Write a protein that binds this ligand. Structure first.
Ligand SMILES: CCCCCCCCCCCCCCCC(=O)O
Ligand SMILES: CCCCCCCCCCCCCCCC(=O)O
Lengths: 352, 352
């Protein structure tokens, strides 16, 4: 399992953070909350976000069915763009793909995104499909890890993960509640794709990106309420408990120590950290938990600032950033994500 | 990859097809359509179905949110019942599980079922999770196929697949339009679970089920409209094209020939067929397109008649039935399913 390509895609409509806010407080039913909205938006540490729709169109997006239908169309466009890009980076072709996995939590599609995506790209009719849905924000790391699991038993194959998250589209379910307003300060739209190859196929594809060495999932007891969707007539409504950061602060070290002990590594042996940008308070929690220097998580901070929180797609944008800035050849890399479960996922990388 | 435990779980309320038709024509907004309903319900070759709610409660199930909530409450219950039954069948404990795959098209759960099930039965906090959504009626075959894919590269491991379909809970989306009435004629509620182990683990636990030898997907081009959902404020509205059978008759024989040749096998080599019970027209098409004697698909016919179309769970019930019938020791087994995509999945087995 060696990564051969990584690529991120973004919708063309980009808006500065306060632009978004300036219009948002004026949306129907939101002006009674200008103050908490401005505060929450200014404290998100996001400087701009890409929106799959013109900012001016969101107030009229009140029907879940309308929103989901648009999701299905845009999601497939962006996912195709990402996959095509990651294949370019790997210098590979659609026909070479033996297994495709898709991750999203922001739309409901049957047939799944992989069926549609594979239809658009002219993938082998016999390609193996794997649509993950319930995973959310953790599916970027967990998805890379599922690639390894597959390629571990299929050493000559090529596998891809595609992650599309169009968070702006969940708007119909947004209420002037604290947890939904937090989601309104953090989340943006985007996609990302990873092309990965088996051990036997790496050398003759000239697979560049890092090896995928291992992963470990960590599912916390009695924590369903930390992250989720309240699903209904209104669509997909965010559940976000305050206890989230406290959870990370109390258990994240053990997740990390248990996994690295297994490889006889310490936190110090990590050459590059690739963390999910849940938001200021969550990034702080990770740094505090693992006692990391301000520079360890700077590419995730940077990511949060430039494109916001992209659910599962963010950890892959950041991963691409990390690859570009060429970490020490042969050093360890750690992917660290968290999502609905509650769970965390850790992936072990080795930079080339 | 060797199967070691299979197990079906059903809701307590069983009703006759006629008990169901009789109350159903009297449901709100339905009496005007009694003729077509009685015609459809009789022609389905379903004699009874298990329902997760008391028959007479459905007229009041009009809120997609209420239905999805109920789906989550009940799906987990049924899910852990099936898994437990398969583990006991396999003489294994929940802590032995290394990866759990979940499959449903009938509810929207974030956190997913596998997380909820894992929390319930006490799976290891580090169990691998694979939440498959959008495979629909093919997820029974496909799920077994991804179990091989996982165990192929983990010969000491245990991986489980848990299917749960509560079709009756999509009632809020139902209206007296044709394809939706066809649905009310065929679909029932239920769940199933498969427990499989790696080759090396096989001898230790003495796995008795069939070997999982190979699989082949077959995605049909430009056929996304054949079946799926139309997701909206009202939930999950069925899309079922009339063209479905014609695609089966046109291309199924080839799907199987290309797949069997690769093993130097002929239809006549197959000792037991485990086919998805789409409904009468579908079963016939399969029998017809291939050249199968009436007895070849009888277990499918019996399952259809006995508990309805359980979506992805059916072929696992039918697998359970087949295992019990004990086909020729050492003979070939072939699973065949079809679903949203449009696609088919074939899985080669070898009985003991
Ligand atoms: C223009 C509006 C943008 C903000 C979007 C509205 C609020 C979205 C709230 C949730 C969106 C993304 C949530 C994903 C969480 C997860 O990955 O599990
Ligand atoms: C009284 C309620 C009886 C049952 C009502 C059935 C409503 C029809 C909808 C069921 C559709 C299930 C389709 C799943 C299979 C698939 O999508 O591939």
């Amino acid at each position: 399992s060696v990564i051969a390509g990584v690529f991120g895609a973004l919708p063309p409509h980009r808006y500065s953070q306060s632009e978004i806010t300036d219009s948002f407080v004026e949306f129907p039913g939101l002006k009674e909350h200008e103050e908490i909205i401005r505060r929450l938006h200014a404290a998100a540490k996001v400087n701009g976000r890409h929106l799959v729709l013109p900012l001016q169109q969101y107030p009229s997006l009140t029907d879940f069915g309308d929103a989901n239908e648009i999701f299905i169309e845009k999601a497939v466009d962006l996912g195709v763009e990402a996959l095509l890009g990651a294949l370019d980076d790997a210098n590979l072709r659609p026909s070479d793909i033996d297994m495709i996995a898709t991750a999203t939590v922001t739309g409901v599609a049957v047939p799944s995104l992989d069926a549609r995506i594979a239809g658009r790209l002219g993938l082998r009719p016999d390609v193996r499909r794997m649509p993950l849905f319930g995973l959310g924000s953790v599916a970027g790391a967990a998805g890379v890890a599922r690639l390894r699991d597959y390629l571990r038993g299929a050493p000559d194959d090529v596998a891809v993960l595609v992650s599309v998250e169009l968070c702006s589209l969940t708007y119909p379910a947004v209420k002037p509640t604290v947890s939904s307003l937090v989601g309104t300060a953090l989340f943006g739209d985007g996609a990302a794709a990873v092309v990965a190859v088996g051990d036997r196929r790496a050398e003759q594809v000239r697979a560049g990106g890092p090896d995928i060495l291992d992963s470990r999932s960590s599912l916390y007891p009695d924590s369903l309420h930390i992250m989720g969707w309240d699903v209904g007539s209104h669509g997909l409504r965010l559940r976000l408990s305050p206890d989230l950061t406290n959870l990370i602060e109390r258990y994240l070290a053990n997740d990390v120590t248990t996994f690295l002990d297994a490889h006889r590594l310490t936190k110090d042996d990590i050459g590059a950290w690739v963390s999910h940008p849940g938001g200021p308070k969550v990034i702080d929690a990770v740094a505090t938990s693992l006692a990391l220097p301000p520079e360890a998580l700077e590419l995730t901070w940077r990511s949060l600032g430039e494109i916001g929180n992209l659910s599962s797609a963010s950890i892959l944008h950041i991963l691409r950033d990390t690859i570009e800035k060429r970490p020490p050849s042969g050093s360890a890399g750690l992917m660290l994500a968290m999502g609905p479960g509650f769970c965390t996922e850790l992936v072990l990388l080795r930079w080339r």
